[PDB]
Structures are given as structure tokens and as C-alpha cells.
Amino acid sequence: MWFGEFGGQYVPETLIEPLKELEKAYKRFKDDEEFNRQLNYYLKTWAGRPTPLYYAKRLTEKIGGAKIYLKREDLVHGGAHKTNNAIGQALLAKFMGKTRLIAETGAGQHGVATAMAGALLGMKVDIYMGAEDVERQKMNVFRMKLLGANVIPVNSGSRTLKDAINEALRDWVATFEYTHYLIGSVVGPHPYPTIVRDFQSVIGREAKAQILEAEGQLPDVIVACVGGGSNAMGIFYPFVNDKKVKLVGVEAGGKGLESGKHSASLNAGQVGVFHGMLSYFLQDEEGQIKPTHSIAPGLDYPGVGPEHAYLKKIQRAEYVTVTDEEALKAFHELSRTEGIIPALESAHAVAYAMKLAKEMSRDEIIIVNLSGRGDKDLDIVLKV
Amino acid sequence: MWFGEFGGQYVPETLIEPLKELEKAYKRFKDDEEFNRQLNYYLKTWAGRPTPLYYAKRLTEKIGGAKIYLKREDLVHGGAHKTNNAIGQALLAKFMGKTRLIAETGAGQHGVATAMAGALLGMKVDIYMGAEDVERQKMNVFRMKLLGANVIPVNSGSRTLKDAINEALRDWVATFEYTHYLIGSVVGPHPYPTIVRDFQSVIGREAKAQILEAEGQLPDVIVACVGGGSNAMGIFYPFVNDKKVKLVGVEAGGKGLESGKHSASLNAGQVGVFHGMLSYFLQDGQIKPTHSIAPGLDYPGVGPEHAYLKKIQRAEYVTVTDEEALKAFHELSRTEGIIPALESAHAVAYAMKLAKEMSRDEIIIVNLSGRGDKDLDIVLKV
Ligand code: NA
Ligand code: NA
């Protein structure tokens, strides 16, 4: 439940029953032979795992320092690592006898991954999304409908993510007998931060075997962007006990940390309670979740998962920030130099790895988690 | 250069030398160990090959006849099978010592694939595109520029694909010493129909191994959409000598064959010279305008190797309308959680019809040539 002092289950009493049932089901199935056979079957034949580990030779030669490798999550079905968790949890729900998935979504990217997994597995899908966010992300709303999901605009309160979370929780209280609440990052009350990390750990397990095959040794550094923290935990987790492997999470610097238009919760936030967890949040003087900004839609989440708060505390991972401008430069540079258009989220990680590689020697190795592809971001990059 | 009575090399004398040199280099590199090592290395690490073969269980059960498997070219880097050929030819060009790639593009899809492959290999990329198509395809043009390519609008003639083709040819005449002309389908003068087929044949080779692993037998039918015909040849070719495997090509029926607004060249075209080859093209003597809701099926011709397979009746060619393709687009999205390319949706639509008339122990593989992210704006605007 706890990662040092971070995590917990800060929920109304009514949710203790569904969370207990979910934890018991997860304990039973997580190492079950049949459950894992079906999960591996869907990951392989539907999602296209394993994803390759790509040596960005041109980008490496240009910078003239460490070798940069890219873990190609951009190639998973849907174009984002989110799929790995959507499948795992949707299948877990099916094994629990659930017939319905619900989820909240801010950018709509988790909404899409949940819709896709629900369609795959023949489940009903209802997605809660703040009305202001429905307005900003019309193509993701269309995608979800195309995939058979029902998008429910949340018109109450602030009409944003926090209002969608509350409606999702309220729904789940009433419908948990047949409905699974599918959380999209390493956030939420226990057991979700653990479950999501476990379903993303395939990223790091593949990358470890791939880098040993390619180079005969572990990486010197692994760099991943951090929203809620799921792609970063997924690639980090299998290396945590490899003491010499440096781990770097990259948060959204937005328009600058001084500008207050960012989403760097670890760097600039404070300890607080939200979404049923004790972790770091960007929140105002009155304890309310405060406005966040990134050019990358998926880095708008106002907090960060408790396992990252813990990793920062014990100094096992370092956490840095990259601005909108630096992420944009990296988005262009990767496209031109390697013919890979990255997600703006992932471009934050590419940006930082480019700075880091320059200092390091040529025999050293950086793996960047390329968490998604940038087709989704073409509109806004063209606008800006 | 010939596939029965189709194919050939209908070019001016100025292009004979470049084509001979390409043929000679291709013979030298196609079975060369190092060339193939590097090709497979890029296909694996950069493009993500092999693509999976997916059993569409829910779609199968819903229709209640044959098993429907999908060869998932939608998961290749870029979202379309075009990447396989773009990497192949770009690497060939590099092994020949070329520093520059040119190509023509209609919807921008081959232009994007060429631009990606050129970026990968450190080559200069110029893309000829008709000015009418440039105006209609804002996002693909942007993709191409974002990938480091230069888009050269063509304002000659009717400002369409045929004018782009003619401009690209004119360029290659001048620049061939250092420029490779990268043709995007199984079309053009020899040796291009052969080369592109050979670079797409990886699709069928994987699919053969994958279906034997899953079902212990070859499929009863293979279904693929046909524009110029590269994704179809890629999946067909390794099964051509497996006599019991039925091969079906699906052309764009558009608004309907009787409406005349379509791109069904095999079905309704006549035999003639166009783009340096003898094959079927849609005509009025002149090139006729074509239509499909799928941008990639708007090519007025078809590869000579399909003309040939049709004539000897090794493959059957059919058509599917815009409306049928759209129904299948929606159906695959809802039922399997895969948003297909509108091109690929033609194959899916036909496979769903055919599946209903077959037994539950029979097997269909559909080539899912690409993903549908690129078509969302079209489908919403509809
Ligand atoms: Na955050
Ligand atoms: Na045609």
C-alpha cells in the first residue's frame, strides 16, 4: 500500500470493499499460468509486442557522446505505452467476471487505450471526461466513439479532470459488481499504483534483454518522461536493483518553472492527498488542485505516482524538467534525423537525453523510453 | 520485364542507361549477405518487423463462417506497408552510392514513407506532388517537411499525380548519377514492378510461417486491397505456387462501377501504356480521373503482375464500394479495437462477405495494409 510514506487508500468507506476485492483478484491472477498465457497472447498478436530497441546512430554521431537507444513503445498498437496497462486491467476485469469498464481521461489518450482494450475483449466502456476537455480534444472523443465507447461529458463543478475522477468514483461505488474502474497511470488508491507498474514492467524487461543482446551490458542511464509516471515505472522497475543503472524521470517544465505554467509535481509541487493517494501535487494555498500546462497533452496530470515520490526520496532516481520549447526542438530533431515522429510527451525524454549524452563518453549507453508516436500531435505542432 | 503480355519498359532513350544500372545493382545486391543483413536490421529495429498475425475472433464469431486472420501491417512504423519498400529501395540507393531520393506522391502516403526512409539513411529527399493534391493534403505535406523532405509542387498540366510522375521522370534523366527514383507500388518500367514486389514479399513470408504455427495449414483464401498492387503482391507472392490457396484482390468500387466514379482498373480499364508499363488503366484514349474514399486507391493504373495473375486466373479480382469500405472501417474498430486504413477496409469488407459463405473450419487471411489514424478527418467530415 505504501512506498515509504507515500500512497495509501484515501477513499470514502464505500470503496474499501471494491478495492479489497480487486486486490484479492490481482493477487490470485497476477502469477496464474492461464491469465499470463492470455495476456501474452493479446500483447503479442494484437498489440505487437515485443517492441524493438532502436539504436539512434545518426542522432548519436551528431551529438558526439554516449550511444542513444530508443525503446520503441511508439510502435505498440494505438501508438502509446498506455495500451499495455489497458489490456492487463481489461483482462483482469474479464477474469473477475466484470462486463463493463469505466475510466476518466483528461487528454483522451487513456480514454482511447481503454476503449480499444474494451472493444478487444467484448466489454462495455463508459469514459468520463470533463466538458472543457471534451472541447479541447475532439478527435480523441471521435476515436473513442468509433471504438464503441460511450463518452460522458462531465458538466458539473470545474468541468475538468478532477470532476471526471469524482464521477468515475461515484459510478464505481454503485456498479463495482459488474464494472471495473480502469486507472491509466501509477496513481490512485492502492492497489492501482502497483498494478499499473506491474503491467508496464514488460517495457523494462524487454529493454534489459534487448540491450544485453545488442551491447553485452546494462545501460548507464535510462531516461523517461513522467506524467503520472507509468511509462517511467515500466522501464525503470526491472533495473531498480541494478545499482549502477542511473534512472532519470523528466517532468514537464512548460513555459518555465518560474512562470507557473508547468506540470512538474515532483520538482515544484508539495505533499498532498488527491485521487486517493498521498503523493506530490501541484496545489494552491487553499489545498485545491491548481492549473497545469504542458505542450504535451499527456503531461497535464497535476500529480505524480507515489512510487516516484519514494524513488526521489531515497535518491534511486533523479527528476528533472524540460520546457515546451526544448520538447518541440527534440520533436523536430528526431523526425529529421531518424525518421521517427515522437509523441510530445516522449520528446521531453529525448530532449533531456540529448543534453546528457553530450557530457558522457562514447562507449556509454542511454536508453530513452519512446513512450508514443507523434501522429496525434501534428495539429498542435503545426499550429505552434 | 514481362509478366505474360504485360509490363515492359516504355521510356525514352534517356532512361535506358539508368534502368540498366538499377537492374545490374539490384541483381548484385538482392542476395548479397551484407545488404540483406542491413535491410533486416532496419526492418527489425526501426520498422518493427515481424508484424503479428491476429485472429479476429469476435469478427469471426459474429459472421459465423470462416476464420478471419489479419496480417497486421498497420503496426509497421509509419502505419502502412509502404515502409517495407521505402526502406528496401532507399538502402539499395545507398549501396549504389546515391545521396538523394526522388518520388512522386498522390495523397502523400508514399511521399511520407519515402521521407522517413530518407531521414533514416541520411539522404536528401525531394517529393514531386501535384499542386491540387498539395492543397488537399495539408497534414501529409507537413509530415514530409517535418521529416526533412522538400515538397516540390507541380503546377504543370492538370496539377495532379500524372504531372508529378512526368516531373519526377524529367528530374531522374538529369540527376540519376547521384539520385534514386523511388517508385511506391508494383508499377513503372522494369525493373520496378519486380523490385517492389520483392521488397513487399516479407509480408507473405511471415504470414505463411505464422498461419502454419497457429492452424497447421495454409489458408483457403488471401484477401488484399489493390491500388497499384504492392501490398497485395507482397502477401500473394509467397503463396503463388501453393495451388490450393485462393488469392483475391479488392479494387476501389467508389460510388459504384456503373457511376464511373471508381478506380477499378483491372475490372473496367483497358490495356495500354502508362507510367512506362503495359497494363490496365482507366481511360476516356487519355487518362481518366479516378475516385475512391481511400486516398491510396486513387491510382489510375495497376501493376502488370496483377494483370498477369488475372489473365491466367491465378487470382480473382473484385470490387467494394466506398459505403461497404466505411461499414467495414466502423465494424473492425467496434468489434476488434483496430481502426484500419480506408484502403485496408476494402479488403476487410470483402473478407466479411466471403467469410459468411464459407465453413467454420476454413481460413481467410486479410492483409491489413495500414492503420486508420490518417483517415479520421475524412471519416468525421463524412
Ligand atoms: Na504531474
Ligand atoms: Na487503380
Q: Domain check: are B166 and B219 in the same one?
A: no
Method: X-ray
The helix/strand/coil state of A71 is strand
Pairing of strands B6-7, B2-3: antiparallel
Catalytic residue among A73, A104, A206, A345: A104
Catalytic residue among B71, B82, B208, B310: B82
The helix/strand/coil state of B248 is strand
Which of left, alpha, beta for A148 (phi over 0: left; psi -120 to 50: alpha)?
left
Domain count within chain B: 2
Quote the CA–CA distance of A69 and B290 in Å, as a whole number: 44
Interface residue ranges in chain B relative to chain A, Cβ cutoff 8 Å: 44-46, 48, 51-55, 58, 72, 74-75, 77, 79, 115-120, 122, 139, 142-143, 146-148, 330, 333-339, 373-374, 376, 379-380
Q: What range defines the domain where residue B19 resides?
A: 3-47+83-200
Nearest CA in chain B to A382: B142
Q: Domain check: are A149 and A258 in the same one?
A: no
Nearest CA in chain B to A118: B337
- Distance of CA A242 from the midpoint of ligand 1 (Å): 26
Record the cell numbers describing residue A218, joined without a space.
Answer: 546494462
Active site residue A34: no
| CB-CB contact of B153 with B126 (8 Å) | no
User: SS3 breakdown of chain B: % helix, strand, coil, rounded to 5?
Assistant: 50, 20, 30
Selected for mutation to probe chain B from A40, A382, A383, A384 (highest B CB count within 10 Å) is: A382
Catalytic residue among B104, B305, B331, B343: B104
Quote the CA–CA distance of B101 and A298 in Å, as a whole number: 36
Question: Distance, in angstroms, between A305 CA and closest chain B CA?
Answer: 28
Pairing of strands A6-7, A2-3: antiparallel
**CATH number where B169 lies:** 3.40.50.1100
Quote the CA–CA distance of B347 and B68 in Å, as a whole number: 12
Residues 6+ apart with CB under 8 A from B332: B56, B59, B338, B339, B340, B345, B348
Q: Domain check: are A218 and A275 in the same one?
A: yes
Q: Write out the H or E segment, with its range, that includes residue A18.
A: helix A16-29
Q: Domain check: are A99 and A217 in the same one?
A: no
Quote the CA–CA distance of A53 and B46 in Å, as a whole number: 8
Q: Domain check: are B260 and B134 in the same one?
A: no
- DSSP state, residue B51: P
Domain boundary among A200, A217, A237: A200
- Greatest pairwise CA separation for chain A in angstroms: 58
Active site residue A294: no
Q: Domain check: are A251 and A224 in the same one?
A: yes
- Note whether B337 contacts A382, CB cutoff 8 Å: no
Active site residue B104: yes
Quote the CA–CA distance of A268 and A280 in Å, as a whole number: 9
Domain boundary among B170, B200, B230: B200
Measured at the alpha carbon of residue B337, what is the angle toward residues B334 and B340, in degrees to the nearest 5? 90
Q: State the amino acid at position B169 in one-letter form.
A: L
Q: How buried is B156 (Cβ within 10 angstroms: 0-12 exposed, 13-18 middle, 19+ buried)?
A: middle
Q: Domain check: are B128 and B89 in the same one?
A: yes
| CB-CB contact of B90 with B121 (8 Å) | yes
Q: Domain check: are A167 and A239 in the same one?
A: no
Q: Domain check: are B42 and B53 in the same one?
A: no
Residues 6+ apart with CB under 8 A from A207: A53, A71, A222, A235, A238, A367
- Give the residue among A114, A108, A150, A113 at the shortest CA–CA distance from A133: A108
Ligand nearest to the CA of B251: 2
Number of H helices and E strands in chain B, helices first, is: 16, 14
- Distance of CA A157 from the midpoint of ligand 1 (Å): 21
Q: Domain check: are B314 and B371 in the same one?
A: yes
Beta bridge mates, B180: B101
- Note whether A378 contacts B75, CB cutoff 8 Å: no
| Backbone phi and psi for residue B273, each to the nearest 5 degrees, phi listed first | -90, 130
Q: Domain check: are A117 and A231 in the same one?
A: no
Domain boundary among B173, B200, B227: B200
Nearest CA in chain A to B336: A120
Measured at the alpha carbon of residue A41, what is the angle toward residues A38 and A45, in degrees to the nearest 5? 150
Q: Domain check: are B152 and B39 in the same one?
A: yes
- Side-chain-facing half-sphere of B291: CA atoms under 13 Å: 12
- Distance of CA A300 from the midpoint of ligand 1 (Å): 6
> Which of A46, A337, A376 shows the shortest C-beta gap to B119?
A337
